[PDB]
Amino acid sequence: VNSFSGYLKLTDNVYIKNADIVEEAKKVKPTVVVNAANVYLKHGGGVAGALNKATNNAMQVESDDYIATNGPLKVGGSCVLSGHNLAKHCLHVVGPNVNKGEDIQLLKSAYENFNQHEVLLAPLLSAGIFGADPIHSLRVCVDTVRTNVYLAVFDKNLYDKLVSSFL
Numbered sequence: 001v002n003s004f005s006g007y008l009k010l011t012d013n014v015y016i017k018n019a020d021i022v023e024e025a026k027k028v029k030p031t032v033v034v035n036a037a038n039v040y041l042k043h044g045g046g047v048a049g050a051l052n053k054a055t056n057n058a059m060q061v062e063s064d065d066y067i068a069t070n071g072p073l074k075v076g077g078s079c080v081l082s083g084h085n086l087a088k089h090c091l092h093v094v095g096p097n098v099n100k101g102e103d104i105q106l107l108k109s110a111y112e113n114f115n116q117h118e119v120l121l122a123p124l125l126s127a128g129i130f131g132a133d134p135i136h137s138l139r140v141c142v143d144t145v146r147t148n149v150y151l152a153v154f155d156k157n158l159y160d161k162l163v164s165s166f167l
């Protein structure tokens with residue numbers, strides 16, 4: 001038993017809810033919140049910008065030190081940093097950005113990072129300003145992630161379409 005509430009169960013291990021991931025992290029305080037990161041950990045907009053704003057820019061400060069030490073992530077890769085006031089940990093995961101021409105097949109590799117964590121609060125990778133089809137992203141998620149994932153979908157219209165179109 002865990003504290004995630006009001007989710008619709010899609011499969012054995014994937015759950016979805018129309019919710020603002022920032023508000024959901026502040027309320028649940030999950031072990032892991034997933035950020036929709038880029039390789040530079042520049043949290044400017046979309047989910048990343050929102051999560052970072054909610055940390056009063058502490059996420060960005062920590063991220064800049066990480067990059068200065070380690071260099072950029074790989075598309076499809078991830079790193080674990082602090083969750084600040086939102087979670088114990090933040091898993092920064094880099095899905096491909098279609099608006100940069102990145103290979104959509106890397107979306108499966110991106111979701112594989114979730115399997116290193118028993119339970120996660122997450123957005124749909126590569127959705128939103130990353131330019132991929134969220135229906136495709138949800139399918140890859142369900143077909144790749146084996147651990148327990150609670151997906152927060154900000155847009156109600158998209159959530160309903162994601163739900164009604166789900167096989």
Ligand SMILES: CC(C)NC(=O)Nc1ccc(C(=O)N[C@@H]2c3cccc(O)c3C[C@@H]2C(=O)O)cc1
Pocket residue numbers: 020021022023045046047050054123124127128129134152153154155158
């Ligand atoms: C009010 C404050 C305290 N909170 C806050 O600013 N929160 C927040 C901001 C932006 C996003 C976001 O960019 N969402 C994306 C979005 C939008 C429309 C269609 C989509 O396919 C997607 C994918 C992705 C998602 O929904 O995961 C999420 C939360």
